[PDB]
Each structure stands twice: as structure tokens, then as C-alpha cells.
């Protein structure tokens, strides 16, 4: 490709009646910067009009719209695809170049665009118009199940994805979609190894996608209290061998190092985890995974003032507003006045979307007590706050009773509510004591204002 | 049918699954396996 670029730079300057020189320019620049292929198609579109009145073939309009599909010019790529359809339909005598396949690819990108333009009805209808004329096509049959997978992972998505595999079992795309179905419900933790080892035969080897999906389903088995039983240590060493193998054959794969940092953090090296993750961070930081893995170290080292932003930055994506798993990571070691009262606000933002979780209802209580012991022990503080503190404490104690009745827990029984409930049963007596302080302070400010008002009467 | 070989023979796949895994740049494992091996000798 280097020789084609250096040859194209020689025909670009000089003008020996260049007609197809700009086509071969953009045909290399689709992998490199996506603006360069666009600049070549703009001039290649107009250079085909000076020799004769000849319409642009659909093959150039289809590809120029394909570049704009990945960009934010979705409406303009839509006009390119509509015009590519109208032009390829006009090719009634181009039976050798198969105008029909050109309209097929243009309509495929057009339904791919409509799926992305908040319009799945038109994408479904366009993708079914390819199914009705050529059921031996795979991407149009795979992209239909994805649209229904938004409404749920048990509709015609889980059925269309397996029907595509029986017609083409040597399709790594269609078979990798199968393991993605079992990722909704992780009850197939150990049992997914079989179905992930189907296309691990040497004719498909090497496949980095499957080998790393193995390491992911193997890492999910960590975070268990059975590490002293010489069970999770073998799991760390097994996944580390998987990652070392896909490292020796691919040094530039990021995901290999991704899991390596996860295991090294599970070994207790937070100080030496930053280094491993650095290489990953530098390449592309714009992966959902990194904003989290990185964020754990900062919160680990009592650095919330770099941790709180990274959580926010993940949430900048157009997918949600109030996730549970983020905010769980958010409150770790929070003790600060801006880290406690404000932490309540984010916890409430999380419970607003789904209160059925036990841990939000538990944490909201823990924080509440934190704040209350910080006004009702050493304080000797504002008057109004004392009134408010007992209100909070009542709410907390109501929750301690309500929690206890709940069957399922966070994979850890909540039987330990006794010391927190003891720690509000005594703090009610602290509220009954410190409200006397309130009154003492009350009379103090009243006598202060009067002994000041008399000085003003002297003047 | 011929509609399969009519499209799979002219199209261009610039990105696929494995493309997503490697960096766009040049990040070898000399700066990775070095620390990976250094962590094992201290243990």
C-alpha cells in the first residue's frame, strides 16, 4: 500500500486528464483518515461530468454515503443512499456489473443507517426487503434480531441468531453471537466453556475474539471468599496463561493487558497496576471498561478527587443517566462533608430508577447514620440541624426494620443489622440530650442580641 | 445462488472483530511483559 500512496502522490499534482485517479486515492484512504477519502470523492464526483453528460455510477455515491454513515452526517448519507438506489435502479443494461447487488449493498447501509436514526420500523422493513429476495444473506438476517433484542433478549432475537448458524456454521460472526446470548444470564458461568470451544478447531485458529471471551468468562469466577482454598489462585494462573498466549501472538491487543491488570489487582498490586493500565489508557481511553478499572485504583488510594470525575465521564455516553453499578463504586471510603451529604443525592438518583435493590436501601441508611453521628456526638453545632438530624435518624430506623424482612440479599446475609440498629437506639438518646444544648445556645444568642441592642441604644 | 458471490467478491471489510482488539498504534509487549515478569520474581 505504501507504493500505491507514493504513486498516487505523483498523479495527484500533475493533470494528465485524470478521471479515475481520485477513485484510487479514496480506495486506500478508507482505513486511514476518513476525511481524505471524502475529499477525493467530492472531486471524483465532479470530474466525471466534463467529458460528457454522464450520471455518476451508483458505486461511487454508495461509498461516499458509506463514509458519512460513520460520521454525524446521517441525513446526508441518507440522501446519498436514496440517490444510489435511484441510480442503480436505472441500470437496466448493466447486467454484467450486477446493478442488483449494488442496490442490495446500498439498501443494507441504508437500513443500517435507519436503525441508527431512531427508526427501527424502516430499518426492519428495509432489512425484510432483503430477506424476501435473498434469504442466503447473513448480515440482513443478523441485524434484524438485534433490533428485537432491545425489547428483550428472549424475543425473535434469540431465535433468529440460532437460525442463522444452522445455514452457515463456519461464520465466526454468527457463532460469536451465540455466546453473547448467554451473557445476559450469567448462570452459564462454568457451562459456557463448552459452547465457546466449538469453533476452537485449528481451521478457525487463531481467533482472538474467542480466546479472550474465554478469559472473560474465567475472570468472572473471581471475587469469591474461597481464595484460601487454593481454588481462585489456580483461576488467576489459568487466565494469566490465556492472556500470555494471546500476548505472544498479538502484542498490540489491548484486551489482553486489560485482563492482566484485573488479575494483578486481584493479587494485591494496586501500586503496580497503574503501570499496566497506562499503556491501555494511552491508546484508546474511550472504552467503557477503562473508565472503571482505572477508577478503582484512585478510590483505593484515598483519591476520590480523581475517582469521582472518571465515573461521571463514563456516564457521558448516550445510554443511561443513573446506573446502579457506577454509584456502587462511587461510595467506598467517603467521609467528607462534600462526600457524604452529596453522596446521598447520587444514591437517591440511583434508587429513583429501580428501588428494588437491597444495597441502595442499605447504603442510604449507612450514610444517614454517618451524618447523624457527625452532628449528634461532637456537636455542639447549629440549632436547626438538631431538629433535622432526629428526622433523618427516625427514617433510618424505619428502614432497619424493613430491610430485615426481605428474603434475598447481596449474596451476603444482612444479619449484622444489630450493631447499626443499636447505633440508632442510642443516638435517639443523643438527640434527646443534644436538644438541651440547643436551648442553652438559644438563650445565649438571645442574651447576646439584647446586650448588643443596648449598646446601640447608647449611640 | 450467485447473489452471494456477487457481493462478497466486490465489497471491502476495513473493520472486523479482531481489528477492534488491537490498538491503532504500535504498542508492543516489550514494555508489558517486562513488568509482567518482574512481578513474578518478587513473589
Amino acid at each position: 500500500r505504501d507504493i500505491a500512496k507514493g504513486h498516487l502522490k505523483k498523479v495527484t499534482e500533475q493533470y494528465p486528464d485524470d478521471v479515475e485517479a481520485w477513485i484510487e486515492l479514496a480506495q486506500i484512504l478508507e482505513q486511514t483518515d476518513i476525511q481524505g477519502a471524502l475529499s477525493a470523492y467530492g472531486t471524483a464526483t465532479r470530474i466525471l461530468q466534463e467529458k460528457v453528460q454522464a450520471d455518476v455510477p451508483p458505486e461511487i455515491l454508495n461509498n461516499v454515503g458509506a463514509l458519512h454513515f460513520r460520521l454525524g452526517n446521517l441525513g446526508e448519507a441518507k440522501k446519498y443512499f436514496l440517490a444510489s438506489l435511484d441510480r442503480a435502479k436505472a441500470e437496466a443494461e448493466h447486467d454484467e456489473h450486477y446493478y442488483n447487488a449494488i442496490s442490495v449493498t446500498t439498501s443494507y447501509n441504508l437500513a443500517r443507517l435507519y436503525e441508527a436514526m431512531c427508526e427501527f420500523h424502516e430499518a426492519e422493513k428495509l432489512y425484510k426487503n432483503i430477506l424476501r429476495e435473498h434469504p442466503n444473506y447473513v448480515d440482513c438476517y443478523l441485524r434484524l434480531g438485534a433490533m428485537a433484542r432491545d425489547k428483550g433478549n428472549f424475543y425473535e432475537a434469540s431465535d433468529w441468531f440460532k437460525e442463522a448458524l444452522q445455514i452457515n456454521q463456519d461464520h465466526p460472526d454468527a457463532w460469536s453471537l451465540i455466546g453473547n446470548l448467554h451473557l445476559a444470564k450469567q448462570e452459564w458461568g462454568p457451562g459456557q466453556k463448552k459452547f465457546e470451544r466449538i469453533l476452537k478447531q485449528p481451521s478457525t485458529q487463531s481467533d482472538t475474539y474467542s480466546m479472550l471471551a474465554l478469559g472473560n468468562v474465567w475472570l468472572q469466577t473471581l471475587h469469591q471468599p474461597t481464595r484460601d482454598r487454593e481454588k481462585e489462585k489456580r483461576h488467576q494462573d489459568r487466565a494469566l496463561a490465556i492472556y500470555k498466549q494471546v500476548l505472544r501472538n498479538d502484542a498490540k491487543n489491548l484486551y489482553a493487558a486489560n485482563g492482566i491488570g484485573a488479575v494483578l489487582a486481584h493479587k494485591g498490586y494496586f501500586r503496580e497496576a497503574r503501570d499496566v493500565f497506562a499503556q491501555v489508557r494511552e491508546a484508546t481511553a474511550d472504552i467503557s471498561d477503562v473508565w472503571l478499572n482505572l477508577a478503582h485504583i484512585y478510590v483505593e488510594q484515598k483519591q476520590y478527587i480523581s475517582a469521582v470525575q472518571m465515573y461521571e465521564n463514563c456516564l457521558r455516553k448516550f445510554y443511561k443517566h443513573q446506573n446502579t453499578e457506577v454509584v456502587l463504586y462511587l461510595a467506598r471510603a467517603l467521609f467528607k462533608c462534600g462526600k457524604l451529604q452529596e453522596c446521598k443525592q447520587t444514591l437517591l438518583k440511583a434508587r429513583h430508577v429501580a428501588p428494588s435493590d437491597t444495597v441502595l436501601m442499605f447504603n442510604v441508611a449507612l450514610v444517614l447514620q454517618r451524618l447523624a453521628t457527625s452532628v449528634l456526638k461532637d456537636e455542639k453545632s447549629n440549632l436547626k440541624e438538631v431538629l433535622n438530624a432526629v428526622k433523618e435518624l427516625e427514617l433510618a430506623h424505619r428502614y432497619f426494620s424493613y430491610l430485615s424482612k426481605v428474603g434475598d440479599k447481596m449474596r451476603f446475609d444482612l444479619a449484622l443489622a444489630a450493631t447499626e440498629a443499636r447505633q440508632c437506639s442510642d443516638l435517639l438518646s443523643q438527640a434527646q440530650y443534644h436538644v438541651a444544648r440547643a436551648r442553652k445556645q438559644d438563650e445565649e444568642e438571645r442574651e447576646l442580641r439584647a446586650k448588643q441592642e443596648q449598646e446601640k441604644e447608647l449611640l | 445462488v450467485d447473489v452471494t458471490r456477487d457481493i462478497v467478491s466486490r465489497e471491502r471489510v476495513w473493520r472486523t472483530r479482531t481489528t477492534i482488539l488491537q490498538s491503532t498504534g504500535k504498542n508492543f509487549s516489550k514494555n508489558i511483559f517486562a513488568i509482567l515478569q518482574s512481578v513474578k520474581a518478587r513473589e
Binding site: 460513520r70 479472550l212 484486551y255 | 457481493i7 471491502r12 481489528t19
Partner: peptide
């Protein structure tokens, strides 16, 4: 107070989905 906030730290690792680039004929 007594102890820190409960949280299940787990260094997760995800995988991306299929790109489905538009076919450049």
C-alpha cells in the same frame, strides 16, 4: 462509621459488539 461502605469491587472486562461496517464496493 465503624467500618466502610460495603461494595463488591470486581475488575470487570467486557467485549465489544460486531462493527458491521458499510460494505465499500
Amino acid at each position: 462509621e465503624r467500618s466502610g461502605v460495603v461494595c463488591r469491587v470486581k475488575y470487570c472486562n467486557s467485549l465489544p459488539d460486531i462493527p458491521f461496517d458499510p460494505k465499500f464496493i
